[PDB]
């Protein structure tokens, strides 16, 4: 919503004379101003709108927050301790948790329904091959 968008045709018509009649620079200086003037053309849009090693991330689970769950069945005494379960009986400690992580992320891969095939009609124009000036 910029006021600078509604400028319609018929308004470019004569708007006085931007420079005054008393401060016209002589030809000599103008020959020297080209370098500065051109740069503004290239970077003015550039100045306004334009503006290593692998590192690991922290492991998702915090050591202090294991929250070990109790078994569903009610074992009474150590006698019936069956080896088939002694898996996961020990909660992780600080030593066990790995020190570094190197994730693989495909958030940029889980997209792109398919690659594009543009079924258009030419529309590229031919510029001629040598000394653009003889090209229609």
């Amino acid at each position: 919503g910029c006021k600078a968008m509604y400028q319609t045709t018929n308004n470019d018509y004569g708007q006085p004379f931007l420079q005054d009649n008393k401060t016209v620079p002589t030809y000599n200086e103008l020959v020297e101003a080209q370098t500065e003037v051109t740069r503004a053309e290239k970077q003015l849009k550039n100045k306004t709108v334009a503006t290593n090693v692998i590192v690991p991330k922290k492991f998702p689970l915090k050591e202090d927050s294991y929250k070990a769950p109790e078994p569903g069945l009610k074992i009474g005494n150590p006698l019936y301790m069956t080896a088939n379960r002694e898996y996961g009986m020990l909660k992780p400690t600080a030593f066990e948790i790995p020190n570094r992580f190197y994730p693989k992320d495909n958030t940029y891969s889980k997209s792109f329904p398919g690659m594009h095939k543009f079924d258009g009609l030419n529309t590229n124009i031919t510029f001629s091959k040598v000394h653009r000036a003889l090209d229609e």
Binding site: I54, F59, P60, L61, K62, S65, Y66, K67, A68, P69, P71, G72, L73, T82, A83, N84, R85, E86, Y87, G88, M89, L90, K91, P92, T93, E96, P98, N99, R100, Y102, P103, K104, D105, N106, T107, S109, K110
Partner: protein, 431 residues
């Protein structure tokens, strides 16, 4: 869009099934309860859209006792309630029962479930199968599970970690019979399989963990360790990646020869791990140590065909590249003529997660190798001798005739081994 769906059939699988998850669970910030207390768990667990992470596993077993352990165990909340299909009568080590009488009316249920799992994960890479060959159930249902799958969908790649009987130690007395018959089913339906003899681990158990009284609970953990290495590159970041679809394309010289035996290192308990620098060069050699082999063999008795070994940890391309440099020259490791370059190298940065309550002492480097060498024939030729001994007088043959199998089934199977046995000799002859 990359995952792995696990199929386990047989009591040995279920017990091994638990072992794998404890190693997997702790490496990705998941507590026992299954409730979380960026996207790195997509390969194994399928997001529900709100709440729990679901294991992508299916457990099959025809006996309820072992399953009865899981559904009231510490991992009670984890697995989905309606995916642990179970039977009512145990096969009783009879391979026939799992292939002609009882398996028929439970095969469907497994078939019905499987299609649902592929309905959610988008880019299923392959199916991992862990089974005990030397059992009536595990050999039976596990065998049929491969038959439909090979035809159910098509050219999907599959992996299987079998458990063949030990040379001088065995549990049952019928393992030689059913195991040989099992080979035929597995020879023409799976791209890759790994020898997993029990005896070796104990010997690996004796020196390294310094535990003189190991139990299967200790046994299971190490196997689950290999699972981390082979599929490690799927869900992490590294300087060079490897994928399942790129394994059976580079470790199979010919379509028939598809038995490669694994070896894992190192194994040094925390009681003494702190007196060796754990240099990469020393570890690299340690893997190829003849006796240490995870399997029932002395590769000094044969050549090598293809060694695709994957490193993990803080490995560097120089630390590995020089290491392979020294290995090639040695006299005690000889390569076949027609593969002058015979290694595939990977890299994964994740330090090897150490399970609590275990034995492994955490180190900054690790290596797991999967190499298919001609020396595999020893078990096949060796196992043949026991099979020859019994069938001669038709001992124990009487019941397999009682489960509906025709007698001719036995005769056909043996011929396959010799052809497989013969082929191994042929490819091994230098040109």
């Amino acid at each position: 869009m990359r995952e792995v769906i696990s199929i386990h059939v047989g009591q040995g699988g279920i017990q091994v099934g638990n072992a794998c998850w404890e190693l997997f669970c702790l490496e990705h910030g998941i507590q026992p309860d299954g409730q979380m207390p960026d996207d790195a768990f997509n390969t194994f667990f399928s997001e529900t859209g709100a709440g729990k992470h679901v294991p992508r596993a299916v457990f099959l077993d025809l006996e309820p006792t072992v399953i009865d352990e899981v559904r009231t165990g510490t991992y009670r909340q984890l697995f989905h309630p309606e995916q642990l299909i179970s039977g009512k009568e145990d096969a009783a080590n009879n391979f026939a029962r799992g292939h002609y009488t009882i398996g028929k009316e439970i095969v469907d249920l497994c078939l019905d479930r499987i299609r649902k799992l592929a309905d959610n994960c988008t880019g299923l890479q392959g199916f991992l199968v862990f089974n005990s060959v030397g059992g009536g159930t595990g050999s039976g249902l596990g065998s049929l599970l491969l038959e439909r799958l090979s035809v159910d969908y098509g050219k999907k790649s599959k992996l299987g970690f079998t458990i063949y009987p030990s040379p001088q130690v065995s549990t049952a007395v019928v393992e030689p019979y059913n195991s040989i018959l099992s080979t035929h089913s597995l020879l023409e339906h799976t791209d890759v399989a790994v020898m997993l003899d029990n005896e070796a681990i104990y010997d690996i158990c004796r020196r390294n963990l310094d535990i003189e009284r190991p139990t299967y609970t200790n046994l299971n953990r190490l196997i689950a360790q290999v699972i981390s290495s082979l599929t490690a590159s799927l869900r992490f970041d590294g300087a060079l990646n490897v994928d399942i679809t790129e394994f059976q394309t580079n470790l199979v010289p010919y379509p028939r020869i598809h038995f490669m035996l694994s070896s894992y290192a190192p194994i040094i308990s925390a009681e003494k791990a702190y007196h060796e620098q754990l240099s990469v060069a020393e570890i690299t050699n340690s893997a190829f140590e003849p006796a240490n082999m995870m399997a029932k063999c002395d590769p000094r008795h044969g050549k090598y065909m293809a060694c695709s070994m994957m490193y993990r940890g803080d490995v560097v391309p120089k630390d590995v590249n020089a290491s392979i440099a020294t290995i090639k020259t040695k006299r005690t490791i000889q390569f076949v003529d027609w593969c002058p370059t015979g290694f595939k190298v990977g890299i994964n940065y994740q330090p090897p997660t150490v399970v609590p309550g275990g034995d492994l002492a955490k180190v900054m480097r690790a290596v797991c190798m999967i190499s298919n060498s001609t020396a595999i024939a020893e078990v096949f030729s060796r196992l043949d001798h026991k099979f020859d001994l019994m069938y001669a007088k038709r001992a124990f043959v009487h019941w397999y005739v009682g489960e509906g199998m025709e007698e001719g089934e036995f005769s056909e199977a043996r011929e396959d081994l010799a052809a497989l046995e013969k082929d191994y000799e042929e490819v091994g002859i230098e040109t």
